[PDB]
């Protein structure tokens, strides 16, 4: 993993771009690892980390979501890629377009024969000023559902202690969609959109924390 945690390689921190779609039997996390993108947290970080470790793959398939109505690909100076302002490779920061953020109601069927792992997030801006500024309305709201699950999140506007000069935060969530099931995203703001899904496998893979060098 070198400088990257599993979660950071997943999300697509620019310095972890080399990790895209790679597989492992054993992923090794170094104590020296650090994030250098937009500051984030993961509710139940340990479980997501765990399920990915066990799946043993970063294979990602891009999908064409219908984000008509909004501006896609929002970026930040806290997340530099090739010397320019960027964002997580696998995530899509949506903002208003022409001062509207229409309520999004976007669908994505799993018509595959395998499960899809979707990684998405909610942005918690540091001020109301940022709120109006990003989403052109005072309060965003996100509902992510399948036939067999639902995850509803209310953005929390407010300052957090600055991380790499950033007082705002993103909260990360995940959703598995079985074949025959459907991903539904209903949002009115603050959605950090997935660009697709990760494939999820089962097998002998795991993760270990260690600072021992790799030998031939």
């Amino acid at each position: 993993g070198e400088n990257c945690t599993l979660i950071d390689a997943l999300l697509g921190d620019p310095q972890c771009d080399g990790f895209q779609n790679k597989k492992w039997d054993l992923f090794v996390e170094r104590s020296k690892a650090y994030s250098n993108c937009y500051p984030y947290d993961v509710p139940d970080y340990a479980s997501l980390r765990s399920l990915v470790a066990s799946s043993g793959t970063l294979e990602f398939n891009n999908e064409s979501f219908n984000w008509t109505g909004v501006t896609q690909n929002g970026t930040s100076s806290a997340c530099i890629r090739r010397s320019n302002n960027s964002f997580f490779s696998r995530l899509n920061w949506l903002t208003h377009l022409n001062f509207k953020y229409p309520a999004l109601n976007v669908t994505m069927p799993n018509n595959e024969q395998f499960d899809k792992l979707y990684i998405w997030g909610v942005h918690h801006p540091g001020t109301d000023k940022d709120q109006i500024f990003l989403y052109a309305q005072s309060s965003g709201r996100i509902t992510v559902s399948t036939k067999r699950s639902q995850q509803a999140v209310i953005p929390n506007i407010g300052s957090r202690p600055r991380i790499r000069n950033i007082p705002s935060r993103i909260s990360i969530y995940w959703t598995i969609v079985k074949p025959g099931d459907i991903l539904l995203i209903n949002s009115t703001g603050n959605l950090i959109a997935p660009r697709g899904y990760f494939k999820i496998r089962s097998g002998k893979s795991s993760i270990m924390r260690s600072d021992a060098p790799i030998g031939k």
Partner: antibody
Amino acid sequence: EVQLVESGAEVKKPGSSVKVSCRASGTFYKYAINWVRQAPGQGLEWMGGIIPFFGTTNYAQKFQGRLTITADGSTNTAYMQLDSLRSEDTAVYYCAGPSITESHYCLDCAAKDYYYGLDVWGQGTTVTVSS
Amino acid sequence: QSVLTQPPSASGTPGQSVTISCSGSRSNIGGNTVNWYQHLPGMAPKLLIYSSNQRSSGVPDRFSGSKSGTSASLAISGLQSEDDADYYCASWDDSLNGVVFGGGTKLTVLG
């Protein structure tokens, strides 16, 4: 892509205030709208700019306290207001911005990052300051 | 004194070439891209060069921009009568927190 059209030529007595408008043919919100003037026999002079998407304004020191720039997104119109006018304020006033687009727009950056080379220009507004 | 220093004048005859220099400081040219403008009597300026060495849409490749250290240059070859104009450099200045222009160079094309 967008075209910029300014209000007509103006004349003001010393000590008064002038306001010039700058209407774009469509949304022009993401990048800095700059204001630049030319007095007769003088070089181009940067006065200031605003990055409308943020409302953030940057002003030249020479004009701080007497220049105010506004951007009203709802009508796609920008404005320059210069108070306490003197003879030195006689100039052609242009508004301008970039036709820049990006696959990905920055949401929390320093003001300088939204200022680019100006390839979209208004037709200019003649302002005369005289008693 | 403009923050960027340009010679007041430059000249050549048709088909010749010229280079116009633009000098600044660490706070401006050293850490920022350079823009170059052409200004003809009566009309708004037109952008020729941005990001120090990239040509604006429709501009022929006989206009070229460069920058190194704390100075920038606009070079013009194959001189034609219509290139006669005032030329301005510009960039962001990190100390003033704003854009600064050079004083301009009056280029004469002796057609």
